[PDB]
Amino acid sequence: PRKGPAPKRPLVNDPVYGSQLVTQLVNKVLLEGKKSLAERIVYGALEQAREKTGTDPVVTLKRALDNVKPALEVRSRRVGGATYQVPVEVRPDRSTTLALRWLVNFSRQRREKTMVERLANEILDASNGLGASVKRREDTHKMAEANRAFAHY
Amino acid sequence: MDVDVSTDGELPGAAEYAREKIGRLSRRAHRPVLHARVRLTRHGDPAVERPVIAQANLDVNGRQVRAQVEGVNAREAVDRLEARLRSRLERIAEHWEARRGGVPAEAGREWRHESEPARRPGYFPR
Amino acid sequence: GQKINPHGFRLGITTEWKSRWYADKQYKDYVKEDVAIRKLLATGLERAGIADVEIERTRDRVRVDIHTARPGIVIGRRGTEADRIRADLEKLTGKQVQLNILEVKNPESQAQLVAQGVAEQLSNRVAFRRAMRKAIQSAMRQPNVKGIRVQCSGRLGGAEMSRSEFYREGRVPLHTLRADIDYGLYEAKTTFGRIGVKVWIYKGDIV
RNA sequence: GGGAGACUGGAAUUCCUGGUGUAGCGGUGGAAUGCGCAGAUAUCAGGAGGAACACCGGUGGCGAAGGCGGGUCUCUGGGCAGUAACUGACGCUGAGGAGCGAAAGCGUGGGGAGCGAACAGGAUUAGAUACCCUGGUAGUCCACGCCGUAAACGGUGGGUACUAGGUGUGGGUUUCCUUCCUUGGGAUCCGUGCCGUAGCUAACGCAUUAAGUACCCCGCCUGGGGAGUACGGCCGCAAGGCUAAAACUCAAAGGAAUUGACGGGGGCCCGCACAAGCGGCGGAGCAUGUGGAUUAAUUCGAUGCAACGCGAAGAACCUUACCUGGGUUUGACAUGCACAGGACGCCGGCAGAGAUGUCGGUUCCCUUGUGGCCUGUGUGCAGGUGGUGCAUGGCUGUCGUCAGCUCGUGUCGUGAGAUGUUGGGUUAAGUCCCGCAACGAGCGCAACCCUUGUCUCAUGUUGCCAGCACGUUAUGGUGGGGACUCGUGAGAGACUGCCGGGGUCAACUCGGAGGAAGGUGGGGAUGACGUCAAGUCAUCAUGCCCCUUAUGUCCAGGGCUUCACACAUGCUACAAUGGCCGGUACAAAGGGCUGCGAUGCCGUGAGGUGGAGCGAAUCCUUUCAAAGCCGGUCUCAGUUCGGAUCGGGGUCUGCAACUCGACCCCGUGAAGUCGGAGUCGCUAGUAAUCGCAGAUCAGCAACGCUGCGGUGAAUACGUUCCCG
RNA sequence: CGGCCAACUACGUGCCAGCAGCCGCGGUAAUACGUAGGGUCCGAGCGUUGUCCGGAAUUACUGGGCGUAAAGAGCUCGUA
């Protein structure tokens, strides 16, 4: 990345849902290359969500993503020999990445005895705006706002 | 400050002197010292004018500080090693007092690598 | 360790193996007898320049071909030298061993002979600059030689400090695979120690 | 703006008074002392006082130098130009001497706004008698006197004459373009800068304002310290200044310039260097290496990157180099000189831990000169993993697969040296292009080599089987067949080749088509001159030194495995993305002759018996896997997690598993709840994870190393910071 | 008897004993120490010490300098 940007990997659309986002989600939950287990977990969580709410799972997944998607983030900047927490605008792709990573992790530290159940509960509460990922977005926005004085550089 | 000395061959009392001298350098270090090792070696060849070789390694909060000297006996080598280590620790400080003269100053006077670039308008001043 | 041996770099491409036989169960003892033959020939003959020794084997009969710059020295007019080498090669458990003594066409274009001569001159009394200059000039005088580098290191001139010196003339492209680099190394025996002489000779390329 | 005196102006700071007006102000890299809430800071009006004079205002003017700019008035010094009226050499320098002489300081008397030594707190720091902050006294200011020093420097004494020019700028006189407005231009005199000849200089540089060419006068120097110090003297209120030694000590101290290296100097670039991510180490248990300690010995070597699962690709005996003890000496092993021989040599017995010793049986072929064997006696000698990798060769690591390192001739310089190799662009690249006192060349870069990705021809066994027949479940199993894979030979294919656009119409660059592949396709091998007296006399070889009834050499036993600790690399976990049980599917690569070893049978299991077939595209390693998929169970617990430790029982290898092997069975069931400071690897078939194989090897300490395939991510905004 | 400065090897020793006018030589392989061979220079002499001149243009009359190497008084006026 010294000589310029690197190309992005065009991951394929999912077969049984036809959405880019679910493939991104399965790649986020993937561990040690066991892709089949990751797909089983994601599909099971989506089906659990569909059973609980009664509608399409992708729409509620998108609602949760929008509820946990951040817009303002803070990065340490060194200008003139001094470092400060500068609020910075987040590009759409990085916002989707951050939202998915937050969802997967905060589901990993739930207490629902199974990762499929934890993931389903986390996505449902994120849809309704009660998840811990929603909270995390709240604190990141709060921190970005509280350092607004440093946004001029 | 705990120091481990790994000598070799014949160097009686070199370990104790080296430990006592090196352990006094902890207060000079501005960050906690995680590890400290000293090695004393002697040259087999009698033709070597400075046979004894002393080396040190300190882990100053992740920053590696090392020095190496030669002497005619253990005491001189240890003392020269202590001097070299003190110089290195002085040059390593990196707290505010050690970097207050290098921080860019003024507004337009003086220029440095990390000096803040001047803000320029779109249109030429004229 | 800087440069790999030039012969081994081009072993499958330009240069060729100096031992030609096939063995599956008897590879190990074949190797043992080959190295025994080589060391015997190295120790026995030193006057005539022994540039290369090839060994060929086929069941009972063993064929050993050697190249020297003075074939008359190593061969007996009545076969006395031939008798001695034949008998003590039979004693090497070689069963039937036959010898084809040969001669090199241009001794000054052969790296091993050049190094041998330079080291022999170095041993007695000669300053190393003289030896390197003479060898370089003699080799470049030959028609096919396109470049020669001579390097010797050690206690040159009986000094207490070891030194490395080298002179080059022409082109010696060590990194080029197709270029054939003739490599020769031989150690000079002096009263103050051992001096090693390496010679690289470049004569065109083989495609 | 030459100096002295008097008077006087406005902006701003501070303070005081009075309004409005509230809760902070002030200060810093970040804060705190501090001020304010008793009314601060802010804003307005008024008043007092002191000091300095924005713009004009500059490398511009004046002064002998120090130095000199708010305005006005008074007194006063010097300079320059023109006319050349006057005098007629009245000139120059100047030892001593006299005068002036920044700032600080001193005395007496005033003044005192701001600033501010000292001094107080605050902060930073390991410590801050400092830098930074808040206060703040002398002082800074005035009058009159002392002092008499400065990087008081142009580090260049004064006067004079001469020696190419070009171009700014200040003061004044004059001819011609002439509008005569205009730096019009010229000439001339006096200043003040820059650039440049000749010349000078060690060089840097100076160069009509000389550091050039000469003449007159003055001051000063004679190696560096001691020392501008002591003593004496003079001056001073004092501080102190001026004049000014020696003893002793060093073999230098110095000036300019060159090449490197370095910088908490600048510019331009790179790299998993950082940033964005994923997984770890540091915590636990165990494996392995090292330090330390211990021991009779714990053989030796390796100490940042670049030592520490390293030499060791295999320590029970051997290895083995160490310790204890027991033997032996031309020796355990070579070759030569001699005297005696027909035996050496084996085969058994006994003693011994064994080395070894002794006893019983067997005895040379040449050919007459002796040759092969050994004996002893010997004698040269062998033999050292004894020392020095700072005496070495060879081999290797490393900066670094970074792009750099040099040479010939020419030119510049007294010379070290420089140029080429720098400048603009470009590249992964000293790669290339354009320029250029340089023109070329060499080692490097790249290419040529291997593997991998596509296709064509050839090719059919032990390899394929699509179309045909025989098959019995057991399948290419079998007759047969090149079709498709595959194996291995040859070849084609990527060359910015083509198109469009940027580009100096140049390098190069962006995009598109075709193609299996696009811009060195992916990965290897290949490591310039050198550096680090880097490593290795323990692979080997080797100079010198040392041992030689031993530091050689044989043997048994022990040790290299010791353990209060420390460090390093790993493996296994701490679980439900999981544990256990059952079923079930897909690899590649490699190995095998006194080796792989199948079917079968016996064990629960290591395994035992047995031996089919295989020097192997055939047989065996099972027909080959594990993660994977399906089903059942466990239900968040120190648990059906975790397996350490320990008890008992076995198997195999081996002469022999006590020290000190691996594996199997039953029982036992520790720490461990995701790990502080800190730190590591990785950019795609990569990280993570899963299994398989090989070397060493009787067995194994292998969780190590070298390979092979399965499943297979996230992220890179960008170079400010860390490292090179 | 290393170079100045004619004239080199072996043995002994090893940062010792020692040498030395200066530079500097002694660290088990010293042309520099000590001793022997050999050599060179002088020779009834040969070396050492002391003192003066030369080399020294290093007090420069012959025959030196003062921008940065030591060296222009801080600047003027003016007496001999």
Coordinates of N, CA and C in Angstrom, one line a residue, chain C residues 44 52 58-59 71 101 121 136 149 162 166 170 172 175 198:
Chain C
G44 N 49.5 -39.9 -6.1 CA 50.6 -40.5 -6.8 C 51.3 -39.6 -7.8
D52 N 41.9 -33.4 -15.1 CA 40.6 -34.1 -14.9 C 40.8 -35.6 -14.9
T58 N 31.3 -50.7 -16.0 CA 30.3 -51.5 -16.6 C 30.6 -52.9 -16.1
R59 N 29.8 -53.4 -15.1 CA 30.0 -54.7 -14.5 C 31.4 -54.9 -14.0
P71 N 51.7 -36.0 -20.8 CA 51.4 -37.5 -20.8 C 52.6 -38.3 -20.7
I101 N 45.1 -42.9 -21.1 CA 45.8 -41.7 -20.8 C 45.6 -40.7 -22.0
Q121 N 54.3 -21.8 -8.8 CA 55.1 -20.7 -8.8 C 55.1 -20.0 -7.4
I136 N 47.3 -14.7 -16.5 CA 46.3 -13.9 -17.2 C 46.7 -13.7 -18.7
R149 N 39.6 -14.7 -14.8 CA 39.8 -14.1 -13.5 C 40.6 -15.0 -12.7
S162 N 46.2 -12.1 6.6 CA 45.7 -12.7 5.3 C 45.1 -11.7 4.4
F166 N 42.7 -10.2 -6.5 CA 42.2 -10.8 -7.8 C 42.4 -9.8 -8.9
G170 N 38.7 -9.1 -19.5 CA 37.6 -9.5 -20.4 C 36.3 -9.7 -19.7
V172 N 33.7 -12.3 -17.6 CA 33.5 -13.5 -16.8 C 32.1 -13.4 -16.2
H175 N 26.9 -15.3 -13.5 CA 25.4 -15.5 -13.3 C 24.7 -16.0 -14.6
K198 N 42.1 -19.7 -7.0 CA 40.9 -20.0 -7.8 C 41.0 -19.3 -9.1

